[PDB]
Amino acid sequence: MTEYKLVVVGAGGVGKSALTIQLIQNHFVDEYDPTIEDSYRKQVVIDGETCLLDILDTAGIEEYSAMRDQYMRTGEGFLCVFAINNTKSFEDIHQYREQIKRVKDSDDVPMVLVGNKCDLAARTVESRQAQDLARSYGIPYIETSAKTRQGVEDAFYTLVREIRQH
Ligand SMILES: Nc1nc2c(ncn2[C@@H]2O[C@H](COP(=O)(O)OP(=O)(O)NP(=O)(O)O)[C@@H](O)[C@H]2O)c(=O)[nH]1
Ligand SMILES: [Ca+2]
Ligand SMILES: [Mg+2]
Ligand SMILES: [Mg+2]
């Protein structure tokens, strides 16, 4: 059926893998095992449409980001993730957007800004600050928690809906 290729990017430790695993496997990964390049595939119904989700979980740690560019190149939509208790990861978003622009050779790529770990209280990135960044990119801002599942389905499904507007 219809297939959507999603790519999750962002700094190391922000929760990219936890978000994907929570979405696909319905459980929270408590430990931190750095990712190289992993992919998941699941058939789901989104807004009445039976579709196949191909999700690429990329490395956030530089030393592990070998041919990251090559893997991202096939992506149709990207989830740019930062953690609300990690200001540096938020500032790093700019760099990921530029990378996506390169790999896709386009300035109009489907994207969604995600503020993960919203279950934690050590917030240093206020919602408003992220809303402003997203607005400048012309994309949605959504907060999530791979731990409680809050906003997880909404983030991925919203990305699909952004791809459909492309
Ligand atoms: N409290 C809380 N912890 C989270 C959340 N998402 C991820 N974590 C925790 O953050 C740590 C790193 O998460 P992980 O998903 O591995 O991060 P990553 O972005 O995939 N790292 P890497 O880029 O190296 O592959 C883990 O200990 C994980 O449990 C969340 O929403 N809430
Ligand atoms: Ca381990
Ligand atoms: Mg990971
Ligand atoms: Mg501040």
mmCIF file of all heavy atoms in Angstrom, residues 3 6 8 18 22 27 45-47 49-50 52 63 73 88 92 99 102-103 112-113 128 147 150 157 166, unseen atoms left out:
data_model
loop_
_atom_site.group_PDB
_atom_site.id
_atom_site.type_symbol
_atom_site.label_atom_id
_atom_site.label_comp_id
_atom_site.label_asym_id
_atom_site.label_seq_id
_atom_site.Cartn_x
_atom_site.Cartn_y
_atom_site.Cartn_z
ATOM 1 N N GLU A 3 3.437 3.830 1.237
ATOM 2 C CA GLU A 3 4.574 3.724 2.136
ATOM 3 C C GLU A 3 5.139 5.105 2.445
ATOM 4 O O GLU A 3 5.264 5.947 1.558
ATOM 5 C CB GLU A 3 5.652 2.828 1.515
ATOM 6 C CG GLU A 3 6.862 2.600 2.399
ATOM 7 C CD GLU A 3 7.959 3.618 2.161
ATOM 8 O OE1 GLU A 3 7.677 4.682 1.571
ATOM 9 O OE2 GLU A 3 9.107 3.355 2.573
ATOM 10 N N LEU A 6 10.113 7.664 7.107
ATOM 11 C CA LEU A 6 10.398 8.678 8.118
ATOM 12 C C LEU A 6 11.804 8.506 8.677
ATOM 13 O O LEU A 6 12.292 7.384 8.821
ATOM 14 C CB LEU A 6 9.385 8.582 9.264
ATOM 15 C CG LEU A 6 7.918 8.443 8.862
ATOM 16 C CD1 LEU A 6 7.042 8.456 10.108
ATOM 17 C CD2 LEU A 6 7.531 9.575 7.918
ATOM 18 N N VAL A 8 14.342 9.887 11.896
ATOM 19 C CA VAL A 8 14.404 10.590 13.173
ATOM 20 C C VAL A 8 15.844 11.043 13.390
ATOM 21 O O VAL A 8 16.761 10.223 13.396
ATOM 22 C CB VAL A 8 13.987 9.667 14.345
ATOM 23 C CG1 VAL A 8 13.919 10.466 15.646
ATOM 24 C CG2 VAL A 8 12.640 9.017 14.044
ATOM 25 N N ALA A 18 14.169 5.769 21.823
ATOM 26 C CA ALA A 18 13.073 5.515 22.751
ATOM 27 C C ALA A 18 11.727 5.874 22.119
ATOM 28 O O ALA A 18 10.749 5.143 22.282
ATOM 29 C CB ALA A 18 13.282 6.305 24.048
ATOM 30 N N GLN A 22 8.902 3.101 21.345
ATOM 31 C CA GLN A 22 7.623 3.256 22.028
ATOM 32 C C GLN A 22 6.503 3.204 20.982
ATOM 33 O O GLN A 22 5.479 2.549 21.183
ATOM 34 C CB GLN A 22 7.598 4.593 22.782
ATOM 35 C CG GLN A 22 6.339 4.872 23.603
ATOM 36 C CD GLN A 22 6.029 3.791 24.626
ATOM 37 O OE1 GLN A 22 5.323 2.828 24.331
ATOM 38 N NE2 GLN A 22 6.557 3.948 25.836
ATOM 39 N N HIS A 27 6.763 -0.021 24.343
ATOM 40 C CA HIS A 27 7.429 -0.122 25.638
ATOM 41 C C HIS A 27 8.522 0.934 25.697
ATOM 42 O O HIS A 27 8.967 1.431 24.660
ATOM 43 C CB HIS A 27 7.980 -1.537 25.901
ATOM 44 C CG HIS A 27 9.063 -1.970 24.967
ATOM 45 N ND1 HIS A 27 10.396 -1.733 25.209
ATOM 46 C CD2 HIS A 27 9.007 -2.642 23.793
ATOM 47 C CE1 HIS A 27 11.118 -2.243 24.227
ATOM 48 N NE2 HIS A 27 10.298 -2.800 23.355
ATOM 49 N N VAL A 45 -2.770 2.125 10.376
ATOM 50 C CA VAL A 45 -3.840 2.859 9.724
ATOM 51 C C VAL A 45 -3.763 4.288 10.246
ATOM 52 O O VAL A 45 -3.864 4.521 11.447
ATOM 53 C CB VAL A 45 -5.227 2.270 10.062
ATOM 54 C CG1 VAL A 45 -6.318 3.087 9.381
ATOM 55 C CG2 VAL A 45 -5.298 0.814 9.622
ATOM 56 N N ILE A 46 -3.559 5.239 9.346
ATOM 57 C CA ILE A 46 -3.465 6.640 9.728
ATOM 58 C C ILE A 46 -4.532 7.404 8.954
ATOM 59 O O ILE A 46 -4.501 7.458 7.725
ATOM 60 C CB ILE A 46 -2.061 7.209 9.404
ATOM 61 C CG1 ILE A 46 -1.001 6.426 10.185
ATOM 62 C CG2 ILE A 46 -1.993 8.699 9.745
ATOM 63 C CD1 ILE A 46 0.431 6.804 9.837
ATOM 64 N N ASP A 47 -5.488 7.969 9.681
ATOM 65 C CA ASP A 47 -6.573 8.717 9.064
ATOM 66 C C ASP A 47 -7.301 7.880 8.015
ATOM 67 O O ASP A 47 -7.609 8.360 6.925
ATOM 68 C CB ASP A 47 -6.028 9.999 8.436
ATOM 69 C CG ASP A 47 -5.291 10.856 9.437
ATOM 70 O OD1 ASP A 47 -5.860 11.115 10.516
ATOM 71 O OD2 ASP A 47 -4.145 11.268 9.155
ATOM 72 N N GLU A 49 -6.176 5.499 6.247
ATOM 73 C CA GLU A 49 -5.321 4.965 5.199
ATOM 74 C C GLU A 49 -4.381 3.887 5.720
ATOM 75 O O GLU A 49 -3.590 4.127 6.634
ATOM 76 C CB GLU A 49 -4.497 6.089 4.564
ATOM 77 C CG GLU A 49 -3.549 5.620 3.477
ATOM 78 C CD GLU A 49 -2.661 6.736 2.960
ATOM 79 O OE1 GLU A 49 -1.851 7.270 3.747
ATOM 80 O OE2 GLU A 49 -2.772 7.080 1.767
ATOM 81 N N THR A 50 -4.476 2.693 5.147
ATOM 82 C CA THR A 50 -3.592 1.612 5.553
ATOM 83 C C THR A 50 -2.266 1.939 4.896
ATOM 84 O O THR A 50 -2.199 2.090 3.681
ATOM 85 C CB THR A 50 -4.070 0.237 5.033
ATOM 86 O OG1 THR A 50 -5.344 -0.081 5.604
ATOM 87 C CG2 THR A 50 -3.073 -0.852 5.413
ATOM 88 N N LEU A 52 2.358 1.663 5.167
ATOM 89 C CA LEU A 52 3.556 1.066 5.715
ATOM 90 C C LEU A 52 4.515 2.165 6.155
ATOM 91 O O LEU A 52 4.911 3.011 5.351
ATOM 92 C CB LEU A 52 4.231 0.203 4.653
ATOM 93 C CG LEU A 52 5.426 -0.641 5.094
ATOM 94 C CD1 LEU A 52 4.938 -1.795 5.957
ATOM 95 C CD2 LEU A 52 6.152 -1.166 3.863
ATOM 96 N N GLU A 63 30.779 10.326 16.503
ATOM 97 C CA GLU A 63 31.619 9.155 16.272
ATOM 98 C C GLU A 63 30.862 7.974 15.669
ATOM 99 O O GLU A 63 31.461 7.109 15.030
ATOM 100 C CB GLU A 63 32.283 8.734 17.576
ATOM 101 N N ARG A 73 19.140 10.324 3.025
ATOM 102 C CA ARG A 73 18.813 10.708 1.659
ATOM 103 C C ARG A 73 17.497 10.159 1.113
ATOM 104 O O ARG A 73 16.842 10.805 0.288
ATOM 105 C CB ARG A 73 19.972 10.321 0.737
ATOM 106 C CG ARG A 73 19.978 11.050 -0.593
ATOM 107 C CD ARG A 73 21.315 10.889 -1.308
ATOM 108 N NE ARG A 73 21.343 11.643 -2.556
ATOM 109 C CZ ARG A 73 20.561 11.382 -3.598
ATOM 110 N NH1 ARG A 73 19.695 10.380 -3.545
ATOM 111 N NH2 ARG A 73 20.634 12.129 -4.690
ATOM 112 N N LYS A 88 21.467 22.527 24.767
ATOM 113 C CA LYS A 88 22.399 22.347 23.660
ATOM 114 C C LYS A 88 21.755 21.590 22.497
ATOM 115 O O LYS A 88 21.987 21.915 21.331
ATOM 116 C CB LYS A 88 23.644 21.595 24.135
ATOM 117 C CG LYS A 88 24.745 21.463 23.088
ATOM 118 C CD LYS A 88 25.193 22.825 22.582
ATOM 119 C CE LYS A 88 26.502 22.721 21.807
ATOM 120 N NZ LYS A 88 26.443 21.662 20.767
ATOM 121 N N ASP A 92 21.289 22.827 18.687
ATOM 122 C CA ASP A 92 21.812 21.967 17.614
ATOM 123 C C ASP A 92 20.811 21.723 16.479
ATOM 124 O O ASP A 92 21.203 21.299 15.387
ATOM 125 C CB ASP A 92 22.216 20.579 18.147
ATOM 126 C CG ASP A 92 23.438 20.606 19.062
ATOM 127 O OD1 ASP A 92 24.232 21.560 18.988
ATOM 128 O OD2 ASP A 92 23.608 19.642 19.841
ATOM 129 N N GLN A 99 21.498 19.928 7.477
ATOM 130 C CA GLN A 99 21.911 18.636 6.948
ATOM 131 C C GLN A 99 20.793 18.031 6.111
ATOM 132 O O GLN A 99 21.037 17.472 5.038
ATOM 133 C CB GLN A 99 22.277 17.685 8.085
ATOM 134 C CG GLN A 99 22.599 16.282 7.612
ATOM 135 C CD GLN A 99 23.145 15.411 8.718
ATOM 136 O OE1 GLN A 99 22.515 15.246 9.763
ATOM 137 N NE2 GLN A 99 24.327 14.845 8.497
ATOM 138 N N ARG A 102 20.648 19.640 2.842
ATOM 139 C CA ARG A 102 21.698 19.131 1.965
ATOM 140 C C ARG A 102 21.332 17.784 1.367
ATOM 141 O O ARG A 102 21.289 17.621 0.152
ATOM 142 C CB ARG A 102 23.020 18.943 2.709
ATOM 143 C CG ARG A 102 23.852 20.198 2.912
ATOM 144 C CD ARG A 102 25.357 19.882 2.963
ATOM 145 N NE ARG A 102 25.650 18.467 3.200
ATOM 146 C CZ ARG A 102 25.624 17.880 4.391
ATOM 147 N NH1 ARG A 102 25.322 18.583 5.475
ATOM 148 N NH2 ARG A 102 25.897 16.586 4.494
ATOM 149 N N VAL A 103 21.069 16.814 2.232
ATOM 150 C CA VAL A 103 20.752 15.473 1.765
ATOM 151 C C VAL A 103 19.567 15.420 0.806
ATOM 152 O O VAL A 103 19.505 14.551 -0.064
ATOM 153 C CB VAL A 103 20.487 14.499 2.944
ATOM 154 C CG1 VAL A 103 21.676 14.486 3.888
ATOM 155 C CG2 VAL A 103 19.214 14.887 3.675
ATOM 156 N N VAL A 112 8.939 17.998 11.401
ATOM 157 C CA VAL A 112 8.206 18.266 12.628
ATOM 158 C C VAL A 112 9.253 18.434 13.728
ATOM 159 O O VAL A 112 10.174 17.619 13.842
ATOM 160 C CB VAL A 112 7.265 17.100 13.025
ATOM 161 C CG1 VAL A 112 6.707 17.340 14.429
ATOM 162 C CG2 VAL A 112 6.128 16.981 12.018
ATOM 163 N N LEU A 113 9.128 19.505 14.508
ATOM 164 C CA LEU A 113 10.050 19.763 15.609
ATOM 165 C C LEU A 113 9.490 19.060 16.837
ATOM 166 O O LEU A 113 8.345 19.297 17.220
ATOM 167 C CB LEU A 113 10.157 21.266 15.883
ATOM 168 C CG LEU A 113 11.124 21.654 17.010
ATOM 169 C CD1 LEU A 113 12.554 21.286 16.611
ATOM 170 C CD2 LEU A 113 11.008 23.147 17.299
ATOM 171 N N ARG A 128 7.274 27.958 24.430
ATOM 172 C CA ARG A 128 7.258 29.135 23.573
ATOM 173 C C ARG A 128 8.515 29.289 22.725
ATOM 174 O O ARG A 128 8.440 29.686 21.558
ATOM 175 C CB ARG A 128 7.055 30.394 24.420
ATOM 176 C CG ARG A 128 7.056 31.681 23.616
ATOM 177 C CD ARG A 128 5.981 31.666 22.538
ATOM 178 N NE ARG A 128 5.979 32.898 21.752
ATOM 179 C CZ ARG A 128 5.906 34.121 22.273
ATOM 180 N NH1 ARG A 128 5.830 34.287 23.588
ATOM 181 N NH2 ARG A 128 5.907 35.182 21.477
ATOM 182 N N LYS A 147 8.656 7.947 27.555
ATOM 183 C CA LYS A 147 8.412 7.244 28.807
ATOM 184 C C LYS A 147 6.926 7.023 29.084
ATOM 185 O O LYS A 147 6.509 5.899 29.363
ATOM 186 C CB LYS A 147 9.048 8.011 29.971
ATOM 187 C CG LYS A 147 8.991 7.281 31.305
ATOM 188 C CD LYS A 147 9.587 8.133 32.418
ATOM 189 C CE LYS A 147 9.552 7.419 33.761
ATOM 190 N NZ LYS A 147 10.439 6.228 33.775
ATOM 191 N N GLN A 150 3.146 10.126 25.993
ATOM 192 C CA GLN A 150 2.493 11.390 25.668
ATOM 193 C C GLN A 150 2.992 11.946 24.337
ATOM 194 O O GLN A 150 4.196 12.088 24.130
ATOM 195 C CB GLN A 150 2.733 12.433 26.769
ATOM 196 C CG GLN A 150 1.990 13.743 26.513
ATOM 197 C CD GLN A 150 2.097 14.749 27.652
ATOM 198 O OE1 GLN A 150 1.345 15.728 27.694
ATOM 199 N NE2 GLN A 150 3.034 14.523 28.571
ATOM 200 N N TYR A 157 2.534 10.639 13.428
ATOM 201 C CA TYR A 157 1.385 10.784 12.534
ATOM 202 C C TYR A 157 1.317 12.192 11.953
ATOM 203 O O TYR A 157 0.921 12.382 10.799
ATOM 204 C CB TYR A 157 0.093 10.454 13.282
ATOM 205 C CG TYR A 157 -0.090 8.975 13.551
ATOM 206 C CD1 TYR A 157 0.993 8.097 13.506
ATOM 207 C CD2 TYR A 157 -1.343 8.458 13.875
ATOM 208 C CE1 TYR A 157 0.835 6.742 13.778
ATOM 209 C CE2 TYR A 157 -1.511 7.103 14.149
ATOM 210 C CZ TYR A 157 -0.420 6.253 14.098
ATOM 211 O OH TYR A 157 -0.581 4.912 14.366
ATOM 212 N N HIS A 166 2.857 17.847 1.149
ATOM 213 C CA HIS A 166 3.944 18.117 0.212
ATOM 214 C C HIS A 166 3.473 17.918 -1.224
ATOM 215 O O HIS A 166 3.719 18.819 -2.052
ATOM 216 C CB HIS A 166 5.129 17.191 0.494
ATOM 217 C CG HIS A 166 6.366 17.533 -0.279
ATOM 218 N ND1 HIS A 166 7.128 18.653 -0.010
ATOM 219 C CD2 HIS A 166 6.978 16.905 -1.310
ATOM 220 C CE1 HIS A 166 8.153 18.696 -0.838
ATOM 221 N NE2 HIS A 166 8.088 17.647 -1.640
#
